[PDB]
Design a protein around this ligand. Sequence first.
Ligand SMILES: *[C@@H]1O[C@H](CO)[C@@H](O[C@@H]2O[C@H](CO)[C@@H](O[C@@H]3O[C@H](CO)[C@@H](O)[C@H](O)[C@@H]3O)[C@H](O)[C@H]2NC(C)=O)[C@H](O)[C@H]1NC(C)=O
Ligand SMILES: *[C@@H]1O[C@H](CO)[C@@H](O[C@@H]2O[C@H](CO)[C@@H](O[C@@H]3O[C@H](CO)[C@@H](O)[C@H](O)[C@@H]3O)[C@H](O)[C@H]2NC(C)=O)[C@H](O)[C@H]1NC(C)=O
Ligand SMILES: [Cl-]
Ligand SMILES: [Cl-]
Ligand SMILES: [Cl-]
Ligand SMILES: [Cl-]
Ligand SMILES: [Cl-]
Ligand SMILES: [Cl-]
Ligand SMILES: [Cl-]
Ligand SMILES: [Cl-]
Ligand SMILES: [Cl-]
Ligand SMILES: [Cl-]
Ligand SMILES: [Cl-]
Ligand SMILES: [Cl-]
Ligand SMILES: [Cl-]
Ligand SMILES: [Cl-]
Ligand SMILES: [Cl-]
Ligand SMILES: [Cl-]
Lengths: 256, 256
Amino acid sequence: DNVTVRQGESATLRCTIDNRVTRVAWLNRSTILYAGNDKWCLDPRVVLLSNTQTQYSIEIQNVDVYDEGPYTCSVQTDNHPKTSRVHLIVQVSPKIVEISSDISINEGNNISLTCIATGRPEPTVTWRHISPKAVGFVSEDEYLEIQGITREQSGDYECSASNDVAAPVVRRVKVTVNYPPYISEAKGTLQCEASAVPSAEFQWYKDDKRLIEGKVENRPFLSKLIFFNVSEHDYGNYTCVASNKLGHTNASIMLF
Amino acid sequence: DNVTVRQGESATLRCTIDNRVTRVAWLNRSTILYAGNDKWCLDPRVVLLSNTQTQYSIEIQNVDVYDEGPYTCSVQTDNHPKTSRVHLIVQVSPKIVEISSDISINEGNNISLTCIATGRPEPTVTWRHISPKAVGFVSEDEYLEIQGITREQSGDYECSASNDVAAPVVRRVKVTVNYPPYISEAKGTLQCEASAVPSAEFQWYKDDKRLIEGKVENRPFLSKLIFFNVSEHDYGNYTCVASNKLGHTNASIMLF
Ligand SMILES: *[C@@H]1O[C@H](CO)[C@@H](O[C@@H]2O[C@H](CO)[C@@H](O[C@@H]3O[C@H](CO)[C@@H](O)[C@H](O)[C@@H]3O)[C@H](O)[C@H]2NC(C)=O)[C@H](O)[C@H]1NC(C)=O
Ligand SMILES: *[C@@H]1O[C@H](CO)[C@@H](O[C@@H]2O[C@H](CO)[C@@H](O[C@@H]3O[C@H](CO)[C@@H](O)[C@H](O)[C@@H]3O)[C@H](O)[C@H]2NC(C)=O)[C@H](O)[C@H]1NC(C)=O
Ligand SMILES: [Cl-]
Ligand SMILES: [Cl-]
Ligand SMILES: [Cl-]
Ligand SMILES: [Cl-]
Ligand SMILES: [Cl-]
Ligand SMILES: [Cl-]
Ligand SMILES: [Cl-]
Ligand SMILES: [Cl-]
Ligand SMILES: [Cl-]
Ligand SMILES: [Cl-]
Ligand SMILES: [Cl-]
Ligand SMILES: [Cl-]
Ligand SMILES: [Cl-]
Ligand SMILES: [Cl-]
Ligand SMILES: [Cl-]
Ligand SMILES: [Cl-]
C-alpha cells in the first residue's frame, strides 16, 4: 500500500490477483499505464514485469518526484469492479541551494544569515559555530541572527540540512568582525605587536620623524625596528603606531 | 668558498688551477678523496668530474649532514704549496619529532605543552590557537604554558617549525577543558538543553519519579520528553537534570 524509492531509482508496483479476475490494469490518476499486456501510456520508463494468474506488476524506472502519488490497479472480478491502490513516495537527498555569502561588519553591528535547503522530506536545517567554545547549535532554524556581535562571535558558521535521505549536507558562511587595533606587545632588537581586523598597518616614529630607510621588518600583526647597537642617536622613546580602517593606537618604547 | 645543498642532493666542489700547477688533490679533513685521478677514499659517493689544466672538481652524491664541513684542495704550484678551501653546508627540512599528546584538564588547571622540532638551521618554532578570536601566535617558543585555563582557551593548538628549507611543518595538540553542566534551554513537546564537558547525561524527574519508559529522546546536549497531550497526570513541574563527571544541575518545566 506504500512504496518508497529515492529519486533516480526504479519503483516496482505489485498487485495480487486470483482466478476470479477477468480484467486488470494499472493507472496513474486516469492516465492508463497498462491494460492487460497493452501499454497505453507513452512514458518509456514504464514496463511490465509480470501478468500471471496471481500477480500483476509494473515498474517505473528513473523515478521522478512528479511520479509521487497514488497508483490504481483496476480489475473486473466476478463481474464486480474492484480497486486496489498504492502510494508511491519519492525521496530526495537534502541540498543547500542558496546560503548567505561571506559577511564583514564592525564589532557591535548586526547580521542575519539564511540557509535555504531543499529535499523530500523538507530538511531539518541547523546552524553551528565553528569554535572551540561552541556546544550544540546556534540556531535550529533556517535563519541565524546576531545583534551586537562581538569578536568572539566571529568565525565560520555551518549550515546543515538533513532528512535522513542518505547523507546530510553542509555549507559554511565566514563572518568577519572588524575592530580597531590594540597593542599586544611593545618593548625594547626592538619590536611591537598589535591585533586588528583588518590587519594592522605599522609605522614607527622618533621625535615625530617617520624614519625612512636609507636615511623595518613588518608582518600583518608584528613590526620589528632593527638597527645596530651603540650608535648615533641611540635614544629611546620610539613610538610604535598601529593603523587601521577603524582607528589607530600606539605605544612608546625605550632602548636601555 | 661556500656551497649549500639539501640533504640527499649532490654537492659539486670546484677548484681553479692553471699551468703553474704540478700536483692537485681534494681532501676531507685529512681523508684523501682524490690525488690527481686516483681515488683514495672508499666512499662510493665521491666521483671525479674534471681534471683539466684550469679546473679540478669532484662531486659528493647523496649528501649527508656528517659531510658538512671544510673541504681542502691541495696543490704544488711553482714548488710553492698552496691551499684553497670550500665549506660544504647541509640543510634539512624542518620536522616535528615529539609533540605533547592530547590533554584534558578541568577549568582552572594548568597545562604545559612542548613541541620538539629538528632541522638545519635549527627551526623557528611557534604555537598558534585554532580559534576565530586568535590573532598571531600564543607562543613564539618551543613551549606553551597556560595557567588558570578557561573554556575559551580550549581547542586545538598548532605547532609550526620553520627554517625556510622547503616547506614549514606543523602538528597539532587538542586541549579539552572540562567543566560542570549548565542549562542552556528549558521550556514546555517538552525539552531541555545543557552544555558540558564531558557531555551531559540527562535524566528527567516528576515528583522524584525517574519515569521509566513503558511504565525519552536524548542527545549529548539535548533531551526531549515526549508524550501525548491532555492525558493522565498531565501535570507540570518536570525537572530536567544534567549530570557529569564534575557536577550536576537542573531546571523545572511546566506544561500549560
Ligand atoms: C502520473 O501522473 C502525473 C500527472 O498526471 C504525471 O505528472 C507530470 O510529470 C511531468 C514529467 O514527469 C511533469 O512535467 C514537467 O513540467 C515542468 C513544469 O511544471 C517542466 O519544468 C518540466 O520540464 C516538465 O516538462 C508534470 O508537471 C507532472 N504533472 C503533475 C500534475 O504532477 C506523472 O509523470 C505520472 N507518473 C508516471 C510514472 O508517469
Ligand atoms: C668528511 O670527514 C668526516 C670525518 O672525517 C666524515 O664523517 C663521518 O661520516 C660518517 C657517515 O657519514 C658518520 O657515521 C655514522 O656514525 C653514527 C654514530 O655517530 C652512526 O649512527 C651511523 O650509522 C654511521 O655509522 C661519522 O659519525 C662521521 N664523523 C664525523 C666526525 O663527522 C664525512 O663522512 C666525510 N665526508 C665525506 C663526503 O666523505
Ligand atoms: Cl549542498
Ligand atoms: Cl565593513
Ligand atoms: Cl568542526
Ligand atoms: Cl562551504
Ligand atoms: Cl574577528
Ligand atoms: Cl591580546
Ligand atoms: Cl592581523
Ligand atoms: Cl586596513
Ligand atoms: Cl612533522
Ligand atoms: Cl580530567
Ligand atoms: Cl586554521
Ligand atoms: Cl596533527
Ligand atoms: Cl571545552
Ligand atoms: Cl549557552
Ligand atoms: Cl555536549
Ligand atoms: Cl561524564
